[PDB]
Ligand binder design. Structure first.
Ligand SMILES: Nc1ncnc2c1ncn2[C@@H]1O[C@H](COP(=O)(O)OP(=O)(O)O)[C@@H](O)[C@H]1O
Lengths: 55, 34, 221, 97
C-alpha cells in the first residue's frame, strides 16, 4: 500500500451541448441499429455518425 | 480492286497507331426513427 | 536554362565534336538530365533533331525521363520500354528514324540486347552509370556491346569506391591504355595522374553555383 | 507502375507527412523535393550511398529548410559502419576534391 505507481492517463474528449439526436431502429431484424448526433459550443458545432456501442 | 493492296496495310496500321497510343498513355501516366 | 547549364552543354558539344565518351559529374540538383536534353535541340547541324537515341536508367526514374520531354522540349518522339513481355515487346511492332528516343533499364537491357541491336543509335545516354561499376557483371559485359558514336555517363557523383570498381567505368569510356591495372596504378603523384586521366572527360563544380541561393543541410547523428 | 502514383501523391500535395524508402530502390533520381527532412533509420555497409540518397531530397526546389538524421546503436555493431564510412571518406574525397 506504501509503494505508489503513478500513471498519466491522457485522453481526447469531446465536450459539447447536444443540438439534436437521431436513433434508427429496425422494424424487427437482427438489431443493426444506426444513428447521428450533433454537438455545439459557444464557438463551433458538428455532426457525428454514430457507432453501435456508442448508441 | 487496287485499294485492297493498300487496305491490307492501312487497316492494320491505323490499329497499330491506336494500340501504340492507348498503351503509351498508360506507359506515360426500413428503420423506425426517434 | 541558367547559363551554367549552357556552359556544360557546350563542353558536351566539344566532346561530341572530338568523338569522346565522358562523365557528367557536375553536382546533383542542377538539371542533371536537363544538361542532356539540349544535346538534341541546341545544335544547328540537323542530325541531332531526327536521329535514333537510347536511355538506360534505374527503374524508379522511368517516369521523370518521359515527363521532362513534356516541358523542356515537348517535340520529341519518345518511347518508354518496360512491363510484362507483351506490354513491352509489342512496342517494337509499332516502330518497325521513324521514332527518336527509347527509355530503358539495366535488368531489361541485359536480356533484351538481341532485340535492341536490330536498331542503330546516334548517341547513348546512361543514367546512374555507377550501376556498371562491376566489370565482372553480365550487365557490363553486354552493355559494352551497344552501338553509337558517343556514350554519356550520368551519375549522382561517380565512383567513390576502391580500385576494383575504378576500372569498369573508365574502360567503358575508353579502351586506350586500359589493358591491365599494373601501369594504371602508377598512372600526391599517382592521384594527380588519375585526376588528369579523368579531367579531359569529367566535369566538377562544388555546390556554390547554387548555394548563393540555397542554405546548408542541418546534419545530425 | 506503382512507383508513379505514390510519388505523384507525395509531390504536388500536402496530404502526407512521411514516406518509407529502401536505401537502394528509393536512393536514385526520384527527386522528392516536397520533403524538408530525412531520417536514415539505417546507414549502408557501402559508404556515401547514404549521401547519394540524401541528395534525392537535397536540391534547389526546397525553399523552406533542409535536415538529415542518422539513428545508430551505441557500439554494438552499427559503429563499424560510421567507422568505415569516416575511414573511406578520405579516399572518396581525394578522387574528386
Ligand atoms: N523552367 C524552369 N523554370 C524554373 N526552374 C527550372 C526550370 N526548369 C528547371 N528548373 C529547376 O529544376 C529543378 C529540378 O531539377 P530536375 O529536373 O529534377 O533535375 P535534377 O535531377 O538535377 O535535380 C527545380 O528546382 C526547378 O526550379
Amino acid at each position: 500500500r506504501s509503494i505508489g505507481v503513478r500513471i498519466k492517463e491522457e485522453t481526447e474528449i469531446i465536450e459539447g451541448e447536444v443540438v439534436e439526436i437521431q436513433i434508427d431502429r429496425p422494424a424487427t431484424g437482427t438489431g443493426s441499429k444506426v444513428g447521428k448526433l450533433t454537438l455545439k459550443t459557444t464557438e463551433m458545432e458538428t455532426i457525428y455518425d454514430l457507432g453501435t456501442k456508442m448508441i | 480492286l487496287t485499294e485492297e493492296m493498300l487496305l491490307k496495310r492501312e487497316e492494320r496500321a491505323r490499329k497499330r497507331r491506336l494500340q501504340a497510343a492507348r498503351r503509351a498513355e498508360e506507359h506515360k501516366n426500413p428503420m423506425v426513427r426517434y | 536554362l541558367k547559363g551554367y547549364q549552357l556552359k556544360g552543354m557546350n563542353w558536351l558539344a566539344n566532346l561530341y565534336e572530338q568523338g569522346i565518351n565522358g562523365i557528367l559529374a557536375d553536382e546533383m540538383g542542377l538539371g542533371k538530365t536537363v544538361q542532356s536534353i539540349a544535346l538534341l535541340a541546341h545544335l544547328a547541324e540537323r542530325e541531332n533533331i531526327w536521329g535514333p537515341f537510347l536511355i538506360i536508367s534505374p527503374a524508379s526514374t522511368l517516369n521523370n525521363w518521359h515527363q521532362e520531354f513534356t516541358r523542356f522540349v515537348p517535340k520529341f518522339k519518345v518511347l518508354p520500354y518496360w512491363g510484362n513481355p507483351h506490354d513491352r515487346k509489342v512496342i517494337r511492332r509499332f516502330w518497325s528514324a521513324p521514332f527518336h528516343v527509347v527509355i530503358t533499364s539495366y535488368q531489361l537491357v541485359v536480356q533484351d540486347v538481341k532485340y535492341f541491336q536490330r536498331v542503330k543509335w546516334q548517341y547513348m545516354v546512361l543514367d546512374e552509370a555507377q550501376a556498371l561499376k562491376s566489370s565482372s557483371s553480365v550487365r557490363w559485359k553486354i552493355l559494352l556491346q551497344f552501338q553509337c558514336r558517343n556514350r554519356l555517363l550520368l551519375t549522382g557523383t561517380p565512383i567513390q569506391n576502391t580500385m576494383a570498381e575504378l576500372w569498369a567505368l573508365l574502360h567503358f569510356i575508353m579502351p586506350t591504355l586500359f589493358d591491365s591495372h599494373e601501369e594504371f596504378n602508377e598512372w600526391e603523384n599517382q592521384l594527380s595522374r588519375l585526376h588528369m586521366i579523368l579531367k579531359p572527360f569529367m566535369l566538377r563544380r562544388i555546390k556554390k553555383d547554387v548555394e548563393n541561393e540555397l542554405s546548408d543541410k542541418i546534419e545530425i547523428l | 507502375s506503382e512507383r508513379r502514383d505514390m510519388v505523384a501523391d507525395f509531390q504536388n500535395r500536402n496530404d502526407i507527412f512521411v514516406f518509407l524508402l529502401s536505401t537502394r530502390a528509393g536512393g536514385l533520381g526520384i527527386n522528392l523535393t516536397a520533403a524538408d527532412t530525412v531520417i536514415f533509420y539505417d546507414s549502408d555497409w557501402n559508404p556515401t550511398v547514404d549521401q547519394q540518397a540524401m541528395d534525392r531530397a537535397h536540391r534547389l526546389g526546397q525553399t523552406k529548410q533542409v535536415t538529415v538524421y542518422r539513428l545508430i546503436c551505441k557500439g554494438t555493431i552499427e559503429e563499424r559502419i560510421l567507422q568505415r564510412a569516416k575511414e573511406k571518406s578520405e579516399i572518396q574525397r581525394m578522387v574528386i576534391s
